[PDB]
């Protein structure tokens, strides 16, 4: 398959990008790109998850005919969990950048805490795989009411048990919870997207999650694919690997063409990449305005 980048490092990603042959980004991100925010996510065992509410097994706090029976105990958890601010960080940024210089096809985000939109990314740019707390809506299939944000954070902090205006049944947040499909919205974006897509951007997931991971696979094989994260993520499992085989990143093989990992702070790899591209000093400005603009509204 085709060599687009002259090297696998951040400095041959960025030289393609600089090309006329990078026109079109994917990013997929995860609760990675969001820890320097203070949002912890809610899957790393050191900010892990309750005992007087008795739940059948620990998952079923997530699991939708749980939730629709006994919804207080996911409602206390929101409480408890419910960010200080929502201040997006330099990595957010980093995409509202690739936003403004129209090289941004899609972000799609496993994160529920809303820092892309909040950083600049429209409903047009975002695909939220794992849906979000940006919009609520009444459980009942008639009515479907929508609720702000806004309404349903009175109602968590207030810890009364959020119902519809219009019908009194249940109003849940647009979240994915387990029983629930991921939104039709993912799969129609994903078969047209990864048509189209000149670089894949990972940033701060470490691929576990599925079908979300499965993304990875979807790439053309001449396209690029940076993953910016703590640890290297997305090769094959030599155990897994066994029974479906095909996609699995490949980074460090005499085979490697195409894969980079940079392993660090989403933060930090976002900078060094801004930087080779010339794009430091307006990042550097954009966010310090909007972290300026968020800190007054807080
Ligand atoms: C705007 C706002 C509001 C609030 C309250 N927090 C935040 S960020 C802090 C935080 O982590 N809050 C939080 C609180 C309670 C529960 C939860 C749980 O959120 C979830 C989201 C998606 C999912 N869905 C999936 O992963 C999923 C499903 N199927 N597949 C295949 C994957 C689950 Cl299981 C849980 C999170 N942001
Ligand atoms: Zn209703």
Known sequence: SERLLDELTLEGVARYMQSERCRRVICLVGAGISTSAGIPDFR??????????HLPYPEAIFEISYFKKHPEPFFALA?????????????????????????????????????????????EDLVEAHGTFYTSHCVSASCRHEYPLSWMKEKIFSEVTPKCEDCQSLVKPDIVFFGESLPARFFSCMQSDFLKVDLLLVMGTSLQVQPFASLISKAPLSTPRLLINKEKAGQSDPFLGMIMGGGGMDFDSKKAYRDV?????????????????????????????????????S
């Open 79 to 123: 409480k408890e969990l419910y960010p200080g601010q929502f201040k997006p960080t330099i990595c957010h940024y980093f995409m509202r950048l690739l936003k403004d210089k129209g090289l941004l096809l899609r972000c799609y985000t496993q994160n529920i805490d809303t820092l892309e939109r909040i950083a600049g990314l429209e409903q």
């Open 261 to 297: 990992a940079w392993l660090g702070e989403c933060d930090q790899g976002c900078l060094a990449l801004a930087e080779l591209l010339g794009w430091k000093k307006e990042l550097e400005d954009l966010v310090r305005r909007e972290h300026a603009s968020i800190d007054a509204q």
């Open 44 to 53: 790393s065992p050191s900010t892990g998850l309750l005992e007087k509410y």
